[PDB]
Amino acid sequence: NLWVTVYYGVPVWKEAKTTLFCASHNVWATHACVPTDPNPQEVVLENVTENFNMWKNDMVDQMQEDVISIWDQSLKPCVKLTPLCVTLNCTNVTLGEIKNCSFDITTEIRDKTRKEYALFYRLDIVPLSNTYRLINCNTSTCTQACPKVTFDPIPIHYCAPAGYAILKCNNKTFNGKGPCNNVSTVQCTHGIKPVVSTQLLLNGSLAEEEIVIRSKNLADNAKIIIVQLNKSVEIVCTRPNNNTRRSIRIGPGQTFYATDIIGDIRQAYCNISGRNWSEAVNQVKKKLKEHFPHKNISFQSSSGGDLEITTHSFNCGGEFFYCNTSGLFNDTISNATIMLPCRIKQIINMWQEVGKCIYAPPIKGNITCKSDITGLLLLRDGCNTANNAEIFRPGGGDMRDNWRSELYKYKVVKIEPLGVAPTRCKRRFLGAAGSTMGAASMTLTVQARNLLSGIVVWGIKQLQARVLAVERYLRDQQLLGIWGCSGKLICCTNVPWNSSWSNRNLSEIWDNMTWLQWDKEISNYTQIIYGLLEESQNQQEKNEQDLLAL
Amino acid sequence: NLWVTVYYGVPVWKEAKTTLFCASHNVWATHACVPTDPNPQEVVLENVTENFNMWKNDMVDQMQEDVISIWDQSLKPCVKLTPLCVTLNCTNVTLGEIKNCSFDITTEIRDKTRKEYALFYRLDIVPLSNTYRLINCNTSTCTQACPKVTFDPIPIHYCAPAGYAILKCNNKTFNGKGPCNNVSTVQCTHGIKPVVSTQLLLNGSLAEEEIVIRSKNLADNAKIIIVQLNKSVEIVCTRPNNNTRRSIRIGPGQTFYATDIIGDIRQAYCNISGRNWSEAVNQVKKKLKEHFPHKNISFQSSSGGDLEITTHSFNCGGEFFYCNTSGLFNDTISNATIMLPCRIKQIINMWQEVGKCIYAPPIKGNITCKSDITGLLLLRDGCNTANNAEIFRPGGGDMRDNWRSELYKYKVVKIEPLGVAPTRCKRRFLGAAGSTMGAASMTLTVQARNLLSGIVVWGIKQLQARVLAVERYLRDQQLLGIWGCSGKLICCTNVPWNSSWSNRNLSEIWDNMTWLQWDKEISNYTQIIYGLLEESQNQQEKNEQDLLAL
Amino acid sequence: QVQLVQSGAEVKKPGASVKVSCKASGYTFTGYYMHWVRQAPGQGLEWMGWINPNSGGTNYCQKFQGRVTMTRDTSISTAYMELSRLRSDDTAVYYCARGKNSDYNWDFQHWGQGTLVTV
Amino acid sequence: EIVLTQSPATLSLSPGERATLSCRASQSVSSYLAWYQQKPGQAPRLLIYDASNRATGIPARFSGSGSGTDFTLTISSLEPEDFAVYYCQQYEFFGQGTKL
Ligand SMILES: *[C@@H]1O[C@H](CO)[C@@H](O[C@@H]2O[C@H](CO)[C@@H](O[C@@H]3O[C@H](CO[C@H]4O[C@H](CO)[C@@H](O)[C@H](O[C@H]5O[C@H](CO)[C@@H](O)[C@H](O)[C@@H]5O)[C@@H]4O)[C@@H](O)[C@H](O[C@H]4O[C@H](CO)[C@@H](O)[C@H](O)[C@@H]4O[C@H]4O[C@H](CO)[C@@H](O)[C@H](O)[C@@H]4O)[C@@H]3O)[C@H](O)[C@H]2NC(C)=O)[C@H](O)[C@H]1NC(C)=O
Ligand SMILES: *[C@@H]1O[C@H](CO)[C@@H](O[C@@H]2O[C@H](CO)[C@@H](O[C@@H]3O[C@H](CO[C@H]4O[C@H](CO)[C@@H](O)[C@H](O[C@H]5O[C@H](CO)[C@@H](O)[C@H](O)[C@@H]5O)[C@@H]4O)[C@@H](O)[C@H](O[C@H]4O[C@H](CO)[C@@H](O)[C@H](O)[C@@H]4O[C@H]4O[C@H](CO)[C@@H](O)[C@H](O)[C@@H]4O)[C@@H]3O)[C@H](O)[C@H]2NC(C)=O)[C@H](O)[C@H]1NC(C)=O
Ligand SMILES: *[C@@H]1O[C@H](CO)[C@@H](O[C@@H]2O[C@H](CO)[C@@H](O[C@@H]3O[C@H](CO[C@H]4O[C@H](CO)[C@@H](O)[C@H](O[C@H]5O[C@H](CO)[C@@H](O)[C@H](O)[C@@H]5O)[C@@H]4O)[C@@H](O)[C@H](O[C@H]4O[C@H](CO)[C@@H](O)[C@H](O)[C@@H]4O)[C@@H]3O)[C@H](O)[C@H]2NC(C)=O)[C@H](O)[C@H]1NC(C)=O
Ligand SMILES: *[C@@H]1O[C@H](CO)[C@@H](O[C@@H]2O[C@H](CO)[C@@H](O[C@@H]3O[C@H](CO[C@H]4O[C@H](CO)[C@@H](O)[C@H](O[C@H]5O[C@H](CO)[C@@H](O)[C@H](O)[C@@H]5O)[C@@H]4O)[C@@H](O)[C@H](O[C@H]4O[C@H](CO)[C@@H](O)[C@H](O)[C@@H]4O)[C@@H]3O)[C@H](O)[C@H]2NC(C)=O)[C@H](O)[C@H]1NC(C)=O
Ligand SMILES: *[C@@H]1O[C@H](CO)[C@@H](O[C@@H]2O[C@H](CO)[C@@H](O[C@@H]3O[C@H](CO)[C@@H](O)[C@H](O)[C@@H]3O)[C@H](O)[C@H]2NC(C)=O)[C@H](O)[C@H]1NC(C)=O
Ligand SMILES: *[C@@H]1O[C@H](CO)[C@@H](O[C@@H]2O[C@H](CO)[C@@H](O[C@@H]3O[C@H](CO)[C@@H](O)[C@H](O)[C@@H]3O)[C@H](O)[C@H]2NC(C)=O)[C@H](O)[C@H]1NC(C)=O
Ligand SMILES: *[C@@H]1O[C@H](CO)[C@@H](O[C@@H]2O[C@H](CO)[C@@H](O)[C@H](O)[C@H]2NC(C)=O)[C@H](O)[C@H]1NC(C)=O
Ligand SMILES: *[C@@H]1O[C@H](CO)[C@@H](O[C@@H]2O[C@H](CO)[C@@H](O)[C@H](O)[C@H]2NC(C)=O)[C@H](O)[C@H]1NC(C)=O
Ligand SMILES: *[C@@H]1O[C@H](CO)[C@@H](O[C@@H]2O[C@H](CO)[C@@H](O)[C@H](O)[C@H]2NC(C)=O)[C@H](O)[C@H]1NC(C)=O
Ligand SMILES: *[C@@H]1O[C@H](CO)[C@@H](O[C@@H]2O[C@H](CO)[C@@H](O)[C@H](O)[C@H]2NC(C)=O)[C@H](O)[C@H]1NC(C)=O
Ligand SMILES: *[C@@H]1O[C@H](CO)[C@@H](O[C@@H]2O[C@H](CO)[C@@H](O)[C@H](O)[C@H]2NC(C)=O)[C@H](O)[C@H]1NC(C)=O
Ligand SMILES: *[C@@H]1O[C@H](CO)[C@@H](O)[C@H](O)[C@H]1NC(C)=O
Ligand SMILES: *[C@@H]1O[C@H](CO)[C@@H](O)[C@H](O)[C@H]1NC(C)=O
Ligand SMILES: *[C@@H]1O[C@H](CO)[C@@H](O)[C@H](O)[C@H]1NC(C)=O
Ligand SMILES: *[C@@H]1O[C@H](CO)[C@@H](O)[C@H](O)[C@H]1NC(C)=O
Ligand SMILES: *[C@@H]1O[C@H](CO)[C@@H](O)[C@H](O)[C@H]1NC(C)=O
Ligand SMILES: *[C@@H]1O[C@H](CO)[C@@H](O)[C@H](O)[C@H]1NC(C)=O
Ligand SMILES: *[C@@H]1O[C@H](CO)[C@@H](O)[C@H](O)[C@H]1NC(C)=O
Ligand SMILES: *[C@@H]1O[C@H](CO)[C@@H](O)[C@H](O)[C@H]1NC(C)=O
């Protein structure tokens, strides 16, 4: 008859919530990250169909926390602009977006003060009949970004700790929700750029097959629709001004950087080819129509909200600014290049954190950024018109949706190497997932050997991960030891197989079924078997002592 | 003859000094604590008599540090009342305990100031002929408790890390010092409330059998006597006033909360039934008499000291206040409910930490607290009177004695699973503690399996604990491996038993003695045996190589 | 090293009150209890009481209850004792003392010079 | 209460000799005793504590022992410098002491 046999290193897994670590004086690519692995091993799991859900992927929330945590830490040692909150006597420089302001500054010696001046943008100034104050003075103290930092969105690779694995959905037309017949396993993600933006997603990944439109629920007009493009659209933005910096000493080793202007003033703007955009829009509308088969499609401007939403926000590698994209989110489009006007802020409120504020220093000389539009965020108007037309608008604001637009292909699971199966006996990477239980047993070492030390503000995470990996490893080894199966990969025991545990044919089990399928059926009695196994060894130990005593 | 045999998983332990972890935006029940275990396993260790000493229990000191560490961290991000230290021009509101004070406040703009007013209690004000200052301005800067915190004494459960165990003394009449014939083992303590109080201990645990009076040494009049009651006494305290709060902006995102009054003013007080108290007092005096068999007993008021000692201090879930309990610590008691007057402080000095200070915000509306007196702290007057009467007074101040009054039933020990015994052979939870060496060997797995991962400002402690558990585990496993006893629970060796190690009968050893008793006798040669065992394996290894070479 | 420095001798009239200071140095003032004991002029020593600087808590010998009081000022590491309703029999040298260990604090290892008070 | 009695009240001794001083109590106090040396015009000085341990700066020749209710101080190789008053103490309770 059949007996219990223990297998260690079987290719099965379950959804898990763990912590991933960062693989590369940048603001994001900090010194605490590890070197990347230049050769990812995309092992194809043929005959394995995993189900993914980008809308419940904890990786996104983890990413969000990571980005913020780093940001805050990076600006920790930077100058706090406390003494800046003084009476501002301002005049003019019709592009009157810049005001020349004078104020009283406290010198190195507390007993002494003097006059000083700086150029500020109207957007950063609040009327207090020509006296003003800095906008932040009634909310919090803005921290001046340290003069020697880099805000370039250097791509970050996420890697799993030993015992865990990252699955990829390689189905180029996957909607981000459902089965992925085309699935592979990797140790790390690719390099994803921490691009902070709204409306139009820049410097992201392009679709590999076609334009894909995905959402949590198209029937829910309170949710955002994410569209990923296959063909990129070039957009170039520039700030054609002599923003000469000035160094103002506001304390004992604390320098404030003020803006100055040498020449004249021209508004910043973006340049996007009309013909290009038009084509892209037409293509997107077509795909939308497929979901909304008997209606017209119209693109309009933002319904309203904070500047950060109504306009296109992005970091041009320098000073942050916002552009008016009403010329793009439209139905009437010209072939000629479209110029979009923009405005610049010195005082920036990151994300949606109240009380958080940073001040950006001026960059001497002009700036020009060449970037690609890779996708965008749209929302649909509620209700329905007799005109049988649906209206879509730009939106965003929650950076999690930006991260979600890149990490949607990844899923994190934990490997459960210990399995039990019925056999006819009595005692005395992960590619095998697609193989049958029998054949899969020939790769137990290949898998098991990589469940311990595969790894060889981020510091604490790496340390925690290391400990966890050890705990799990030892736990399993302890069990194998107790059951008298130490050092074995396939261990036949002295416990008989139950009839209530399975009614499957032995041949089907080993020749047809895979370990994943088996687990889902036999797991019902996991603890039952373990208990019996422990009792068996106890019996054996006393029997050995009995014999030894002779 | 007899030979050395190694046993792994034997039920023995020794006193140890380790770190316990917390099991549950509360000030104490922080996010860093783990979920509790709803089903403690009080395993009774029959025939085991452990000795406890509440006066040397490190758990108490650990608790003290925990409470403070959390407190400090919790108030870290809260507003520092620096700018408050200005000239105070005060007038009257005979209950003249509240003064209306005006002062100069610096506005959001550093260049601008204005007039402002607030109500303060006399106790928080120091004369500087009607000009005052805040009491703390010459000591430290008080931190205003964040407006969104909770000071409710949510009970905390202490749990041991793997390899350690917590013993309980279940003897209802245990004095807190000596043998506990009634002893059990648990994984975690019960939920103990972090109640900060003096004199009368509120919301604590009640005696299960009778009123118990315990002390380190009754002959030492410099020590505190702790009495635990079986029958609780209800006490209700209230602050019947319209303490309407006002929000004053004292900086860039910094709001100070001032007190205001809408109606009239009435002193706070506590209500305690006279008859109830009288009965409790009589009972306590009786028990004291047992220790002091030929003398009278008198209860008097505090001899003097800081307000925190002379009066009854406690947190009413809101604003801290102190009550005059001279009406309770007396020999003349009325049946009628006794009203005890109290005074309220806004500025509180926590514990006895100099330089530490917090400011409590006003609570809009009145407050009433219903609580039970569960025990109290008394001290005895030194010397002796010809009147043959002893006088006891209220006291306290060192919170450690409050914690000590709850944790006195617990003891922390470490398990030493490795044991050695003489047998007639040659090679080639914790309930067993009450069992003989022979029988106890049948539960080695039950114990051993829980000495690795039984666990599955607090963060670092949990991480440290995890590592320690691993270190100990591996150490022992390494030894078993070296001695050629890997994977075994009972391993017969090739080393003969010495005559100098023991003169006990083999039968007595296995049939009568327990592992605890054995350890205390055989430990004398622990290292001696280990050395020999290592040499044995070395001999075996070279012998195997010799044979293999053939 | 450590030391206790007491005020100089004092003479009061019967019925009056006397205040005696004791400055401590060389150690944490709040580390230990301060004890007061008086040496009778040709007889054994009589313990008065002690104070705990951490909270100002006190314990007086019963026979002096209502006559003697004690306090402290941590800012200057100085203890104070006061005796009211002075009598001729109160003539003695009042000593300022500290114990060796925080556990058993009756081991008066450290003493001041003593302050002679009479009527 | 505790009442401590010592004897002999006075001892006329010579240099080089050895002598001991008794101390009794009506109640058992285990070993929580102390002995103090007292010289004219001088502050009290701790000599022995725990009825076994020498105080700092105290020569080995100064010792003592006892248990429960019967204790004794022992001083060997007596010197002229030992001609002082010695007190027995338990908690706040002081004895009468003896003079050498
Ligand atoms: C989507 O992705 C695209 C790219 O894929 C992003 O566009 C990129 O954005 C970055 C960041 O702004 C651009 O790099 C920056 O370019 C500045 C212009 O350089 C030119 O003029 C200077 C003037 O003398 C020349 O020297 C330069 O020539 C040198 O660099 C080129 C680069 O390939 C070489 O080929 C040449 O051989 C030369 O080596 C160019 O002609 C440039 O000034 C700036 O450099 C500063 O910042 C970098 C940050 O990494 C520092 O390493 C560097 O040392 C400089 O910083 C120092 O000097 C400043 C001066 O005051 C100090 O303030 C600093 O503290 C520090 O001392 C940087 O190189 C990049 O060119 C651009 N690429 C394209 C194609 O647009 C998009 O922005 C991105 N989208 C979004 C939204 O981010
Ligand atoms: C020994 O133990 C005993 C208990 O075993 C302790 O006594 C307890 O102490 C706590 C803390 O003070 C008491 O809870 C507090 O009670 C306040 C009074 O509530 C009543 O009036 C309000 C007015 O509208 C009603 O709404 C309430 O009804 C609701 O609550 C009762 C409770 O059972 C329910 O049964 C009802 O169905 C209602 O749900 C009552 O009639 C109460 O206001 C206060 O609530 C604030 O604080 C809690 C803290 O955990 C917050 O969760 C809560 O949201 C409130 O805080 C918000 O609002 C305030 C208002 O300004 C803001 O400032 C805050 O920032 C926040 O926004 C709380 O519930 C408890 O009742 C009391 N029990 C007894 C029997 O006395 C002893 O104190 C303890 N001894 C010592 C020394 O601690
Ligand atoms: C900290 O400091 C910040 C400073 O910005 C405070 O935020 C400001 O709070 C005040 C308080 O109400 C806000 O005033 C209200 O503003 C709304 C809208 O006006 C703004 O947004 C419009 C967008 O559609 C924009 O067009 C406006 O610009 C025009 O008007 C200004 C005004 O002079 C003019 O200068 C411009 O050139 C433009 O002409 C402007 O940006 C306004 O509708 C409110 O008035 C309504 O409500 C009042 C209340 O009863 C009523 O009496 C009025 O008749 C009317 O119904 C009101 O003016 C101010 O807008 C906030 N700032 C911003 C940028 O929004 C913040 O509150 C401070 N913190 C704290 C804790 O105080
Ligand atoms: C930081 O700021 C704090 C402010 O509190 C400082 O602490 C204060 O230090 C001074 C310095 O000595 C203390 O003054 C002494 O106070 C004692 C006792 O008085 C207090 O306690 C009494 C309790 O029994 C209480 O009754 C008193 O209240 C009465 O008297 C006040 C005084 O006007 C009156 O307003 C009340 O209505 C009551 O009538 C009071 O609370 C006092 O005895 C001292 O005087 C003696 O010593 C001097 C010194 O030679 C001598 O000249 C006198 O004749 C007398 O012998 C003295 O007044 C003050 O009490 C401390 N505050 C508190 C609350 O105790 C702290 O020191 C500052 N830090 C630093 C580093 O400076
Ligand atoms: C990006 O994805 C979009 C998805 O819609 C692609 O749109 C494709 O556009 C072509 C032409 O407008 C559509 O018609 C095709 O024309 C060729 C002409 O020879 C014909 O052979 C095809 O059978 C088809 O008729 C095509 O249907 C349309 N795609 C879909 C799914 O409808 C767009 O071309 C993609 N761009 C890139 C660069 O991949
Ligand atoms: C809490 O503990 C105290 C401990 O003293 C208990 O006191 C007990 O009080 C009763 C009555 O005052 C004492 O006398 C008993 O009376 C009953 C009456 O039927 C009698 O049967 C008993 O034999 C006894 O005489 C009792 O001796 C006393 N306890 C002791 C140890 O002396 C108090 O009752 C306890 N309260 C509760 C609620 O448990
Ligand atoms: C990628 O996933 C999509 C679905 O997310 C698959 O689309 C299926 O296409 C077939 C073609 O006829 C349809 O019958 C199915 O109903 C589609 N699925 C859904 C959910 O609509 C697509 O085939 C997948 N591509 C690959 C290569 O696996
Ligand atoms: C958005 O589209 C509308 C039309 O769909 C644009 O309105 C046209 O603007 C041009 C010049 O700006 C006029 O000559 C046309 O007559 C307008 N159309 C109508 C029907 O009046 C509108 O300008 C577009 N918005 C942007 C920013 O380009
Ligand atoms: C995925 O399923 C296919 C279809 O059954 C497997 O291909 C068979 O593999 C067995 C293995 O010896 C061959 O005997 C069959 O002839 C194969 N059939 C075909 C149509 O090729 C494939 O091996 C499965 N994948 C894995 C990893 O086992
Ligand atoms: C403490 O107890 C004493 C008596 O033991 C109380 O003194 C009595 O107080 C009442 C009224 O307050 C007087 O009528 C009695 O005559 C007093 N007794 C004596 C002997 O004079 C004292 O009041 C009690 N303290 C408190 C706060 O109640
Ligand atoms: C605690 O001691 C009692 C008394 O010896 C033990 O009870 C004995 O257990 C043996 C075990 O087989 C029995 O044969 C005896 O008859 C029992 N005696 C009595 C009076 O019951 C008890 O087992 C001990 N506890 C443990 C855990 O062994
Ligand atoms: C969609 O737009 C086309 C454009 O000509 C129009 O003919 C068609 O009727 C519209 N659909 C609906 C439902 O109106
Ligand atoms: C570009 O010009 C062609 C000319 O026929 C026209 O059909 C097309 O719609 C124009 N596109 C835009 C975006 O103006
Ligand atoms: C195991 O075998 C026994 C044999 O009678 C049977 O009763 C039981 O239901 C089987 N299954 C389990 C889970 O025990
Ligand atoms: C046993 O299998 C059934 C199958 O649906 C499942 O619902 C049930 O929860 C399983 N029981 C256990 C203990 O796994
Ligand atoms: C104790 O108090 C009672 C009360 O009447 C009294 O009779 C008894 O004598 C007192 N005990 C002593 C020793 O005085
Ligand atoms: C309560 O009244 C009774 C009446 O006989 C009296 O004996 C008792 O002592 C009184 N108790 C108090 C506390 O007043
Ligand atoms: C062990 O046996 C030897 C044998 O002669 C003996 O000398 C020795 O004292 C015994 N004990 C120890 C601790 O070695
Ligand atoms: C040997 O046993 C005696 C028994 O009292 C003990 O004092 C001594 O310290 C022990 N030696 C060792 C090395 O354990």
Numbering used by the authors:
A (entry chain B), B (entry chain A): 33 to 56, 66 to 134, 150 to 184, 188 to 309, 312 to 358, 360 to 394, 409 to 504, 522 to 549, ...
C (entry chain H): 1 to 52, 52A, 53 to 82, 82A, 82B, 82C, 83 to 100, 100A, ...
D (entry chain L): 1 to 91, 96 to 103, 106
Q: What did the original publication write about this model?
A:
We therefore engineered a disulfide bond between G459Cgp120 (426c DS-SOSIP D3†) and the VRC01GL heavy chain A60C (denoted as 426c DS-SOSIP D3†-VRC01GL). Using this method, we purified an enriched fraction of Fab-bound trimers and used this sample for structural characterization. This strategy led us to determine two cryoEM reconstructions of the 426c DS-SOSIP D3†-VRC01GL complex: one with three bound Fabs at 3.8 Å resolution, and one with two bound Fabs at 4.8 Å resolution. An additional iteration of refinement was performed by adjusting only the X/Y shifts. This refinement scheme resulted in a final estimated resolution of 3.8 Å for the three-Fab complex. The VRC01GL constant domains of the Fab were masked out during the final rounds of refinement and omitted from the final model due to the inherent flexibility of the elbow region. We note that the closed 426c DS-SOSIP D3†-VRC01GL trimeric Env conformation observed in cryoEM lacks a formed gp120 bridging sheet, which is reminiscent of other closed SOSIP trimer structures. Our data reveal that VRC01GL could also bind a prefusion closed conformation, which had previously only been reported for its mature counterpart, VRC01MAT. Our structural analysis reveals that the 426c DS-SOSIP naturally lacks an NLGS at position Asn234 near the CD4BS, which is otherwise conserved in 80% of known circulating HIV-1 strains. The 426c DS-SOSIP also lacks an NLGS at position Asn362(363), which is present in 42% of strains deposited in the HIV database.
